[PDB]
Amino acid sequence: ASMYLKEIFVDNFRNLKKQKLEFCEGVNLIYGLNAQGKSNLLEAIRLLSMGRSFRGSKMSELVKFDEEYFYVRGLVRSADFYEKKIEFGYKVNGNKVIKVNGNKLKSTGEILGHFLTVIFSPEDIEIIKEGPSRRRKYLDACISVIDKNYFFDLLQYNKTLSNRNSLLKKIKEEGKGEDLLEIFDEKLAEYGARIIKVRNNYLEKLKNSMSKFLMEISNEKLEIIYLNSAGVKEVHEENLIREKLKNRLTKSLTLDLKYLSTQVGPHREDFKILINGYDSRVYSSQGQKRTAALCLKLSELEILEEETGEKPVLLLDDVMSELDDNRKKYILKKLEGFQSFITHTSKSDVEGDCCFKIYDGIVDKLA
């Protein structure tokens, strides 16, 4: 039984009026003339998956202008639940309150997995086009939805990384800190090796899944190069990678003290998408990049289902309007057995099993 959002209630959320909405199976077409309105609804849905705004927005920005809180409640059907309640509340205080079936979660990260979605947007092309930062963050979020252990390791890794970076400054002003520096190096190498091993594993699946879609769509060839920070290309034996990280951290101490940051580790790494053997960021055409962005999300979807045994809900934020007919048809074919939410400016273009009109932030069914 696939994931299915039966209902969402939004209160003081961005520009949406207070309302409870009920949805259907298959394609939920949401059309309207407002920008914020449509994608704000998608933002509220995606929030129940991730515990954050997909736009990258801070929580205080999600509260309705001049209000003191927002609140979102979804009801979801999944493999093991007829109807799970997920609640996300934020008070301008600065505390998120998140509950699943009435139990408050200790940390936001705990939300991950109760409600699976994959969100498509035209912005996904930036994952192809931009720097390592954008691709690490995409990669980290994809793996974390599947793998709680990886999420745990990344949290600790990033915590140790900032502790180390601030210690570098203390070691520069005063001296000393040699002991905490060893302790941090050891921890970075330990967490780093596990992060690298899991990343390598995911990217191998990404490569296999993405090459199939690309071959299907444009008959083009896909390769992925993972340049990891251990410089290894083996990534079986964790202790070998851990040792390579540790030695590298030791060898780069002079450079680290000059810049007051940490030059080696997975927080610096990237992966390279090759299209017909050429670097997709600097060589490929825009059409190719766009196609690659689509294959990227389709793969995400495929790996997510395969790994969790659950079939996610699909969010498509304004991704249909600039497509030609053959690409629309392809994408629609691929959403076949999912619940999906497709935002559009038009009612006619893609039909949809249920159609909703949004205006002045009220969503009404049929039109």
Author numbering: -1 to 365
Paper lines:
Domain II is similar to Lobe II subdomain of Rad50 and SMC protein; however, in the Rad50 and SMC proteins, helices corresponding to αD and αE extended into a long coiled-coil region, which was absent in TTERecF. Comparison of the structures of the ATP-free TTERecF and one monomer of the ATP-bound TTERecF dimer showed that the two monomers were similar. Notably, two structures differed in terms of their conservative Walker A motif and Walker B motif. The KD values of the TTERecF monomer interacting with the 21mer ssDNA and dsDNA were 576 nM and 1.63 µM, respectively, however, the TTERecF-ATP dimer binding 21mer ssDNA and dsDNA showed KD values of 16 nM and 6.2 nM, respectively.
RecF is a multifunctional protein involved in recombinant DNA repair, homologous genetic recombination, and DNA replication.
